[PDB]
């Protein structure tokens, strides 16, 4: 018998107690313990004259923010931003997701990154986006993950009419991500054209997993709670708010339905001047859905849109993937499925340097009260860090 399962665990860098998750342990119980106040008592104050020492060394030789250069911020999220970063000894560009510690305690959501963090560190995927680096410090959590110089799709909509041609394209493309996800055992439940961006060449990876689930062995969730942004939502996840909701990886192909619907028409099928709104009709989706008679489709492409846009019990992908793969709409004499991802993208960027954000838009003070007895602001955020 053996301490040799012991060692094992600790190097296994998927591990939640491998030493970078131990030496965060030990560097967020000193944060969270030196205050006035705590110090007051013995054991605490005795164990911080042991490790305060060292524990503000080790952080020395730590990653930090200040071994990157601010280029410019890319994006603006309720919990943080995205900035683009050039970090100083290797020269290389990065994009650097910033989560403010403080406005996740306080929005009472703060576990959501931890499915996101795996993934993109060990999916080895061309359709997920890369982490490199995860690391903290006592304000922020900071993500460094390969920039995508084409923008997301959001912008790509907007700037461009999207023919049929292009559709099948980037739509064939959400569909190889969305079931290697699948794959991954995960359900991604917040597919948008926000977090659909594209690389270099034109093609495209998912770039955010803040809402992905675990399967059961069945394939599975048990989830009780509405997540995803509203317009995208599927009826399913929408009911499961009220309880005891059960629901497989449909619920994604639902938002593909919904992303080839905005890219053809220009409007989003359950569009509504309030959320209230929205939800109401997509509930109501047997009768709320239609196509307006002027925005021309074709009969394929309506129909693989209607295939998806039913009921889970004979949503387009209950079979598997296999199903949607074969779909006519799919036809055409540019890409087959196995090599999709090295045919000529129907938009490649132009871009004149390395660090070109023209493809996203420009944007345009908060610390945690000192406590008296012990909060632990920190302990969700142990494990956090990671080196490639």
Same mark, same amino acid.
């Given at each position: 018998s053996?301490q040799?399962?012991l060692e094992?665990?600790i190097?296994?860098?998927r591990?939640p107690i491998n030493?970078?998750?131990?030496?965060?342990?030990?560097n967020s119980?000193?944060?969270?313990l030196? @205050?006035?106040?705590?110090?007051?008592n013995?054991?605490?104050?005795n164990?911080?004259?042991?490790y305060?020492?060292?524990?503000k060394?080790?952080?020395?030789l730590?990653?930090?923010?200040?071994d990157?250069?601010v280029?410019?911020?890319i994006?603006?999220? %309720?919990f943080?931003?995205?900035?683009?970063?050039?970090?100083?000894?290797?020269?290389?560009?990065y994009?650097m997701?910033?989560?403010?510690?403080f406005?996740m305690?306080k929005?009472?959501?703060s576990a959501?990154?931890?499915?996101?963090?795996?993934?993109?560190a060990f999916?080895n995927?061309?359709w997920?986006?890369?982490?490199?680096?995860? @690391?903290?410090?006592?304000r922020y959590?900071?993500?460094?993950?390969?920039?995508?110089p084409?923008?997301?799709?959001v912008?790509?909509?907007?700037?461009?009419?999207?023919?049929?041609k292009?559709?099948?394209?980037?739509?064939?493309?959400?569909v190889?991500?969305?079931?290697?996800?699948?794959?991954?055992?995960l359900?991604?439940?917040?597919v948008?054209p926000d977090?659909?961006?594209?690389?270099?060449?034109g093609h495209?990876?998912? %770039?955010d997993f803040?809402?992905?689930?675990?399967?059961?062995?069945t394939?599975?969730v048990?989830?009780?709670?509405?997540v995803?942004?509203?317009?995208?939502?599927?009826?399913?996840?929408?009911?499961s708010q009220?309880?005891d909701?059960?629901?497989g990886?449909?619920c994604?192909?639902?938002?593909?339905?919904v992303?080839?619907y905005?890219?053809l028409?220009?409007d989003?099928?359950?569009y509504?001047?309030?959320?209230?709104?929205t939800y109401?009709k997509?509930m109501?989706?047997? *009768?709320?859905?239609?196509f307006?008679?002027?925005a021309?489709?074709?009969?394929?492409?309506?129909?693989?849109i209607?295939?998806?846009?039913?009921?889970?019990?004979v949503?387009?992908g209950r079979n598997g993937?296999?199903?949607?793969?074969?779909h006519?709409?799919?036809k *055409?004499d540019?890409?087959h499925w196995?090599?999709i991802?090295e045919?000529? %993208?129907?938009?490649?960027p132009?871009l004149?340097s390395?660090?070109?954000?023209?493809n @996203?838009?420009?944007?345009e003070?908060e610390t945690?009260?000192?406590?008296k007895?012990f909060?632990?602001?920190?302990?969700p955020?142990?494990?956090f860090?990671?080196?490639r």
């Amino acid at each position: 018998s053996r301490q040799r399962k012991l060692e094992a665990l600790i190097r296994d860098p998927r591990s939640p107690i491998n030493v970078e998750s131990l030496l965060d342990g030990l560097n967020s119980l000193v944060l969270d313990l030196d @205050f006035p106040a705590l110090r007051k008592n013995k054991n605490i104050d005795n164990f911080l004259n042991r490790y305060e020492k060292i524990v503000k060394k080790i952080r020395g030789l730590q990653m930090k923010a200040e071994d990157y250069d601010v280029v410019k911020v890319i994006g603006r999220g %309720a919990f943080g931003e995205v900035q683009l970063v050039r970090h100083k000894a290797s020269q290389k560009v990065y994009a650097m997701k910033l989560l403010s510690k403080f406005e996740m305690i306080k929005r009472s959501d703060s576990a959501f990154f931890w499915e996101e963090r795996d993934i993109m560190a060990f999916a080895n995927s061309p359709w997920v986006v890369q982490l490199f680096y995860a @690391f903290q410090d006592d304000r922020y959590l900071y993500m460094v993950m390969e920039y995508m110089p084409g923008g997301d799709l959001v912008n790509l909509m907007s700037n461009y009419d999207v023919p049929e041609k292009w559709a099948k394209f980037y739509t064939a493309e959400v569909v190889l991500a969305l079931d290697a996800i699948h794959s991954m055992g995960l359900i991604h439940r917040d597919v948008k054209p926000d977090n659909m961006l594209l690389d270099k060449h034109g093609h495209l990876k998912l %770039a955010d997993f803040g809402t992905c689930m675990k399967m059961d062995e069945t394939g599975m969730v048990h989830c009780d709670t509405a997540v995803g942004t509203p317009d995208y939502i599927s009826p399913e996840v929408l009911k499961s708010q009220g309880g005891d909701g059960f629901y497989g990886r449909e619920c994604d192909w639902w938002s593909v339905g919904v992303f080839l619907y905005e890219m053809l028409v220009g409007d989003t099928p359950f569009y509504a001047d309030s959320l209230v709104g929205t939800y109401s009709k997509i509930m109501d989706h047997k *009768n709320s859905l239609c196509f307006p008679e002027d925005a021309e489709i074709s009969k394929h492409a309506k129909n693989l849109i209607c295939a998806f846009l039913t009921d889970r019990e004979v949503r387009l992908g209950r079979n598997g993937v296999e199903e949607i793969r074969q779909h006519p709409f799919f036809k *055409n004499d540019q890409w087959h499925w196995d090599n999709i991802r090295e045919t000529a %993208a129907p938009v490649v960027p132009e871009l004149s340097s390395d660090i070109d954000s023209s493809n @996203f838009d420009d944007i345009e003070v908060e610390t945690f009260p000192i406590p008296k007895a012990f909060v632990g602001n920190q302990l969700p955020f142990i494990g956090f860090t990671y080196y490639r």
